[PDB]
Design a protein around this nucleic acid. Structure first.
Lengths: 138, 100, 74
RNA sequence: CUCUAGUCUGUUUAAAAAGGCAGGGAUGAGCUGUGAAUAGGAGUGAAAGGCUAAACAAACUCGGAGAUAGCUGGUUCUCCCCGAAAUGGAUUUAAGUUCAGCCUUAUUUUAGUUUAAUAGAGGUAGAGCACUAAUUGAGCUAGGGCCUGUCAAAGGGUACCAAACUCAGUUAAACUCCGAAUGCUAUUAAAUGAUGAAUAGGAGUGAGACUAUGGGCGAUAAGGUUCAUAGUCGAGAGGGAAACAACCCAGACCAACAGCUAAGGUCUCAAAAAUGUGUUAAGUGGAAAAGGAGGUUUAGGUACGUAAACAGCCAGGAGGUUGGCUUAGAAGCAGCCAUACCUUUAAAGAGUGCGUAAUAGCUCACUGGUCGAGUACUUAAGCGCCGAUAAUGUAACGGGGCUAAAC
RNA sequence: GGCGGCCGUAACUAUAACGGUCCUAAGGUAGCGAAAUUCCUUGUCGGGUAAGUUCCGACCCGCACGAAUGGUGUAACGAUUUGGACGCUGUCUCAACGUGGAGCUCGGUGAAAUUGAAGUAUCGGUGAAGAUGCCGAUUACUUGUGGUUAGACGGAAAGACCC
RNA sequence: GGGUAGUUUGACUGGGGCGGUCGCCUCCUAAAGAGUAACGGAGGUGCGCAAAGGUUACCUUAGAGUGGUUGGAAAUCACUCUGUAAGUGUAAAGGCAUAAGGUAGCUUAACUGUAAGACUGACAAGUCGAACAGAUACGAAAGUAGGUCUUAGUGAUCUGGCGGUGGCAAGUGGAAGCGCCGUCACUUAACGAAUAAAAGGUACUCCGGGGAUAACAGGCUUAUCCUUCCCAAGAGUUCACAUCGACGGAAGGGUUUGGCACCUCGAUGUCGGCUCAUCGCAUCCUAGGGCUGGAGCAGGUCCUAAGGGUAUGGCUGUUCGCCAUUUAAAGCGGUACGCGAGCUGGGUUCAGAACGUCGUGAGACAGUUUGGUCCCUAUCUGCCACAAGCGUUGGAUAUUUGAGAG
């Protein structure tokens, strides 16, 4: 998995996440990107499922960059309890993504193969996506 | 049908059932009001056309400071910066005509 | 498994008591603070707990120098 | 003669504990008549908290007594004026009470409230990496081990484990070199007219609810719970949302068989619309997701074309060459590698699929002729399609119906 | 009134006669044991049955048996509890007919709890979240009698449970 | 000295109990003045110091790099860069270069009487404060000092003790005693402190109330559960999709275990069985199909289809499940987990008694065993049947078409 190896505080308050993305919204390290069309949370584990999909589809052709890291605990109270004590316990990790976050970046392979691999990745994420070529190079 | 969904749906339908003709009348009134307020140092007659019930507290205070308590209220005021600011605050509830 | 914590002190009501430009007479409290968030300028004094107070009647004013705020009576 | 297991009737009963079938004891710790004795914190009790006048975990009558209740219920004629609160603090307090806050009456006082202009203090939203932490990919390189002229001397090959540093790129309520909008405070000038304040008499309230925003907890579940701002209900009638305290419009002094309008509507039930330009074929309208999609309107890209594009039709669709192979076979189609493999080249790919142990065999990209303009892949919007899915009865337009009477 | 733990150990595997150790006032002997005690559990095996969570006979891993709050048995006894068998049967397959008192009709006498009243239908909804009374629609001549209890959150007892 | 008597035995609490908590201080939540809740998120605290206080004067860390007896990554020394990241008794925050940090000298202001004016505030309280008289400490002096860089280290009243003062002194003079000033004794911690002095059981229970508050149902929600669907790595001789589909993704159903506490505690009777059913289709059988890695027989998967049917017994109170025989099949669910003013009362949930466990005990146990009253004549709607009256346009008597319904 992907998860931070040390935290100041184990539990943090669920904010309201809204607005488009004003940062981390441009293709930087690669050729093709997987932008999101929604604002939501992507768990670490869906992240690694999409990563396996892309990497396995790519027969050594190029490189894959993951532009999100979870670092947000998601707590869940025990199964059968009432509303009493407070702030149960970390269960899994979430990453925040907003409309316009690049979220995934790929290098090396032909455009057709990249588009296929990256639809294969989009099939496993909880948000609508769009595959973008640099739109300023080819 | 689940109550959460039906309440959301009923509210959405009521909101969306507004008439474009009425909206156009309101837009025309707003344009007229802004055109008048853009002037400077004229006597303007202010009619109150929307009620005070349910509006914000600050805006009710502004209207009572202008002198309007009911719908159908008539008051003549001399446009300076103070009155211009009050009219801008409460532009959506007034009708401005000009006193030649 | 109850809550390990839940403990808070009484709010101390700090902050600026007289706004810049207001008229004060001698001995007024202007700022309550922990530490010199605001420093002392002309005609004011600092209490043992860094309270800012007015040594004479006048009008409060805040100035800024090198990024530090100074309170004075003019 | 005495008691009552089992079962039924009875159960507003014939009976305030019986009756019909029956059952147990019946020479004994037996049954029974007539007197007498033991009295309420006491009696008696082969012991069930049983019984002591049909009521016993402390009888009955009278008296204290009109006991006490922070609890429940009730509290009787009319009109006029003003008009809350369900918050804060404390509490053997949390369904109580008290002070403040909010209300009213009387007197005195005059200065709230909203702007505009000028001038002030924040650290929130947002943003940022300059601090504290988290973190992505390269570059670099200590240090750690691996390997090697190895002893453990000084060494060298570094796939790595990787500090620091450089470039690029991210995260934060308890990070901030930065930083608004509103809100808050002071003054002045206008505008509004008793809405401010002081003293005194009398209170009530201290269970709130939903809606629109910002949040915390929960599972970005609840008509959930707990706070902040404003509104309404509460304490508010009237019109609209089919019905529907909290939503929308709007504050009911009384009367009129008058008019203009707000929300919301104008085929009909049911008071009120017609014309203009388009869209929709699903009754969409008149519920909803991931996803699929030669539905259609409009606009725009990339391929491709009157020097013949696409679909069809007629041909070739090969030779070197079983590409070298792995394998047993692999002859284009188990599988490895590329196919920088060439030629005849019209065009023929180390072959698109079907199918053969292995081919063989049938097809396609590929290109030529007949035909004769848009086609083939995508992008943004306006409406649509499927996904669509519970139990009394059509039942997800209020009904009839509507192709507009829908958008 | 009380009557313990942990660890290691044999010509497979298993267990541990045995040994060590800590602690206590002392650490459960005889006998009994999935029991009126056994949570896991319908433990495991055998008997009974075509099929047995009950029953009987054992095994012992006794959550949480145990020796006058007696332990383990016992002839006889029991309107006690439990399992099996024979006989017998309307208990049942499966109900039918007949009999007596009510019920039904008429005459005489004549209550009751209950009751805001009432030209009190149904469905899909709505609503203090289960509607005779509200909305839309559907259905229905007026009024009695003999039956039946689905509803009127029916009647009865200021809920005994909970706070 | 429970033989007897009078009493106490807290509250908050997403019902109560169990557990946890109760005062004060720091930060976040807190939405840029102040304030603002929860059994929201992180910590501290019931002190320490005769200097670690006051004042005067003088100095500046930590880190990285670099050169060095042991000496190493890191001790002490020197330089460069960096410029407070170090250090401030003690948590955190705000501050601290003029340093509030480090060192040294002297010293006791860790003072008496006061205090204009304020902050914060229901009240009680708490906090800051120039300046004045007395008398010191340091300094040449100006000046600073009424403890500690700041904010926690605390406790009302009553009662009593100790020292001082000499005000009150029951006829007078004294005195006991009291008052005044200084000051000591409370995990009164449940920390605005009901007493100087206080634990439990009730299923033998009783009373006043509450749907302000739980258990059974309805309602909201869908975590969990169930039913699908999206992506297709693969398995399947090759062949993703005959079939299975992992890893993830999107929904519906309201049936399971739960969440909430909105209706009902001047009563909505709780599990099964019996009787009687009605409805949904997510179809167990019969019927119609598509594809199969479907030869045939027999299946597998999917689609359409609710007309009818869908077993008898053994064990258990059981629903459920297992088992024995059958059968074309032995469907899944809603309806107050259908149906007690229709029935049964085996189970659960009263008072008897017993076993194990817990408690010194009274007793307790979603541990077990045994015994243990199931009330009501139908007013209304509804339903199953049968009549009286009238209508159907003159009034009657036979025979029938048929909407519509079973």
């Amino acid at each position: 998995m992907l998860s931070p190896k040390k935290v100041k505080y184990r539990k943090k308050q669920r904010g309201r996440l809204s607005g488009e993305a004003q940062k981390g919204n441009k293709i930087s390290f690669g050729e093709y990107g997987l932008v999101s069309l929604e604002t939501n949370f992507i768990t670490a584990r869906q992240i690694e499922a999409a990563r396996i999909a892309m990497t396995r589809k790519i027969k050594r052709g190029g490189r894959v960059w993951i532009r999100i890291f979870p670092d947000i605990p998601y707590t869940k109270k025990p199964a059968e309890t009432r509303m009493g004590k407070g702030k149960g316990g970390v269960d899994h990790w979430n990453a925040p993504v907003k409309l316009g976050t690049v979220m995934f970046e790929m290098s090396g392979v032909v455009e057709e193969l990249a588009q296929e691999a990256m639809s294969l990745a989009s099939s496993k994420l909880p948000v609508k996506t769009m595959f973008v070529v640099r739109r300023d190079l080819r | 049908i689940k109550r959460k969904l039906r309440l959301q749906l009923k509210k959405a339908r009521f909101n969306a059932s507004r008439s474009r003709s009425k909206n156009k009348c309101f837009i025309k009134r707003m344009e007229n009001n802004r055109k008048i307020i853009s002037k400077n140092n004229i006597n303007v007659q202010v009619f109150l056309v929307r009620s005070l019930i349910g509006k914000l507290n600050k805006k009710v205070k502004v209207l009572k400071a202008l002198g309007l308590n009911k719908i159908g209220d008539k008051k003549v005021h001399f446009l300076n910066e103070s009155i211009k600011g009050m009219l801008n605050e409460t532009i959506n509830m007034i009708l401005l005509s000009e006193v030649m | 498994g109850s809550s390990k914590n839940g403990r808070d002190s009484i709010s101390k009501r700090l902050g600026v008591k007289r706004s810049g430009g207001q008229f004060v007479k001698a001995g007024e409290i202007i700022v309550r603070q922990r530490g010199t968030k605001f420093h002392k300028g002309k005609n004011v004094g600092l209490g043992r707990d860094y309270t800012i107070f007015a040594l004479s009647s006048g009008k409060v004013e805040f100035k800024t120098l090198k990024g530090r705020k100074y309170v004075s009576i003019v």
